[PDB]
Symmetry: C6
Subunit: 218 residues, 6 copies
């Protein structure tokens, strides 16, 4: 990554054994559960495009996903080139060449160049731009790998309301690759078991999730 | 987080793998037991609103709770906006929650002179929300805690305060009232103003 | 905690995940065995009253003990106020030292003032007083009930003897008398004869070598 | 390794117990699966030739592979010597002796010389050069230790499309020791080797379908 | 401990959670096997008397040993006092053991010029006491180590020297018959290496 | 160890719990397998004689080996005295020197690397132990009838490395012995490749 030292300079620092292992374990243990994305973004704080490629490439399984991710990255890189053509000609002294899409993805750029861009004044945050593409791709994969439609989540006859709401929102989160309406509100009440369904209908519209859960406790 | 370095300067620093992991494990292991909150506060020492969202979002289960927490944060953001409708732009509620603000801006508010402590403000909302969840996820009402006939007084007091914590006068009044018959008389005998130590010695 | 930076100033530093976890695990694993106290004191090196409260509050079980501890702290705070009645710097009330009515900024102010008012160290003293009470109470055995098994090795018996003694928290004179009266007296038959044989004035080392 | 301190200076630093152990464990656990190479590259960030030899030599098993690796290194060192004849003559004041192939592989050079070259201005990155040779050797080993041909990967009759695509690309990756494999040939072969139900649906989406589209289709 | 920092200064630093735990676990796992002592010495590098007491006091079991150790310390402190009954006050025995001195004073002596290494002096006494305990807790006399009839020479030598070490020519004597003859054959002045190669 | 600070000076720093533990575990887990030596060398980077003695003395088992090692160190220290405040043999082995003396020498200009000198003696001793503790002659390594060539070459070179405490073993003798002891099917294919075949070529051939 690129971190701030004691003298206040932005310097390069080797990616750590802790970080490498943490990311590899997360993938092994949680596959593409939604929460894996916030974890990737945090573990890659300050990352260079090289560091980002290191983290992706250390993943052993899930090659189908890794391959989809490559395609998404290539799309974004092409889009970037469309919007940011590169000028022919020589670079002025004290200046950096302009980054192509493949430069931002660390494919055609060196570490020195990546560092050059990230610590230039003004900076070109190639690490943060690349990270945004990767996260786009990761979101697609999370939605795809979502194991259950929200329509199939229905409260067991003897299942506590909390356990059912847990299943509901865990499922909802995977389907949109997001934690962010009236439709789901109606669907949640609709799929509750008989006893709860009536009590909930009784609270009327505009009830907070807190009120609903208090209402159906045991 | 934003830390004082060794040269005495205030700067941004990446949230650490150690921190990330500790928080996730605490939630896996202890769910929403009351002691999780002091731990959250301490693991998020110096946190930006970004860092706070990272900690929350890395949680995998408990989506019901996480969803309740979101609603609470929204209420607080809305209430903040109501109290606040070459000079610096002040944070909307959603800015403090890191939804509509950048890291750059967050660092901006927190290190301004005078600072607007968006980290600390946001952390307060989150802790409000967490306290509600702790209260909800509590197995028993304090009224259902009553000393077993063969249950040692210490074990009963443990259950009493464990339960109470998960939820001033509800103490002294209720603890003695729900003690078993033998202890209850001895305790009412010590009269008022007895220390917990004295009570526990009495019913050993 | 408050530690020293490179400019030589005493600066505030966030309590670390390693410290937080260590303390919580010690309580889970050892409850209120006597050695838990030296460990608390070391894990809280350089602590602010805020840090101190964090360590206590992260404990999940033992709420009876935690409650007794709050009472002890209140006693000490009141005693402090009694002994300290109301460009001169303002001094700490009892509840300021306990971090209940003071901010981190104030706590840092007192601790790094010249001369310092070590609110962290003062608060830690009160906490350790309370912890000592709890260790004494949670001691499972009276020293009088420690007797060598017929087939129990002398070392294992002496271990139980002194761990029990340490938890009860005898004064040196009492620890001596308890040793003199009780240790040889309560040894199993075989060892008791051999030990009486070494005569008076034998060191614990000598005794333990003898009965190995 | 050679790292940047807080003063912004490049200095030598001892290889850490964490790095040593991570690398040894990776080899024990994943042998020569393709993802071991990006991991080696990262664990050896800033490595001197000495550090690189340490990491290789701490591997206990796989002596066949370690032996092949030595041969690959020797080839590259010879090739280096061929292209960089160390010119005879004394060493100019404030320069260093040019590196022979065995100098880059840390066989005939000292830590001091290695540090000399790596922190010179301009630097001669003997660490990064050596690392390149090592990775060439490793890539050969990965391709050799690959069990299956890509031609033997066909979707089970009741095997989910995702599981089949996983095996397809895992295998393709080991065979080339690379993830840059999706050309038109593999694109045709993926659809060709799908089970009957999927094969029809896929042919239906027509040409130019993204892997995401294909996988949604056969879910 | 008192350490050398980055700016080349000697300063006090808190004992670390890693060090605290490493020491406690070593005692839990190895008790008083001889190798525990080198480990104690290394884990207490740069230790103040206060740090030394922390390390000792965090041990939960082995209170018999901890009590013996206390006695050994008192002996050494008394001996120290006996040998020593802008002029800097010198430490008494109980000052070195951190019983009657403050961290401030401990730091004063240790960083004075020239230093009075109360840390290192105290560590010397503690290690004396630990050695005694190691000797006592040695399960077997060296005289009872005799090569099994079926036991490989190496395993027997391992037991021999593990025992001997704990307790601070007879080796050939107690070897099994086959080895005993071959060894007496190599004659006197044989290296342990030579002996072990011989009985492989 | 002795490491570099921020002012660019070489300073003493306490050996870390991690380093201590790593070494002790390696010995517990791998005993005296050959790869233990490159691991010791690395874990003792920048070590003072003091640090080296610490690493050695923290080993609990293998006292026979530890005892041989002590003898080897003595021989080397005597030899050093024969060939020679300036350091005697026992000074380099940290027996009769203080940490302060050890630090002077190592950070002097020019340095006298008593750490690196002591480390070389220790590694001499360890190599002897590695060779002694080796279980199997290279002559007894022969390819199973159903054993894959790679597995056989693995065993071959594993064994060769322990016997010599070295990986520089591929000479013409071992080259002849490797092909000779291959199973019938592979033996013929290998003889077919003719002389001067690389190990890579041989392994591709018998896959």
């Amino acid at each position: 990554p690129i971190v701030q030292n004691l003298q206040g300079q932005m310097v390069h620092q080797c990616i750590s054994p802790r970080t490498l292992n943490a990311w590899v374990k997360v993938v092994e243990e949680k596959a593409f559960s939604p929460e894996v994305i916030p974890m990737f973004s945090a573990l890659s704080c300050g990352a260079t495009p090289q560091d980002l490629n290191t983290m992706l490439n250390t993943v052993g399984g899930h090659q189908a996903a890794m391959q989809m991710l490559k395609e998404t990255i290539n799309e974004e890189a092409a889009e970037w080139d469309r919007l940011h053509p590169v000028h022919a000609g020589p670079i002025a002294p004290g200046q950096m060449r302009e980054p192509r899409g493949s430069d931002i993805a660390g494919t055609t750029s060196t570490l020195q160049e990546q560092i050059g861009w990230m610590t230039h004044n003004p900076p070109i945050p190639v690490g943060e731009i690349y990270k945004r593409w990767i996260i786009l791709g990761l979101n697609k994969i999370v939605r795809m790998y979502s194991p259950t439609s929200i329509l199939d989540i229905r409260q067991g006859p003897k299942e506590p309301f909390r356990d059912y709401v847990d299943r509901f929102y865990k499922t909802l989160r995977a389907e949109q690759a997001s934690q962010e309406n009236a439709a789901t509100e109606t669907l949640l009440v609709q799929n509750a078991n008989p006893d709860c369904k009536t009590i909930l209908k009784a609270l009327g519209p505009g009830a907070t999730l807190e009120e609903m859960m208090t209402a159906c406790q045991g």
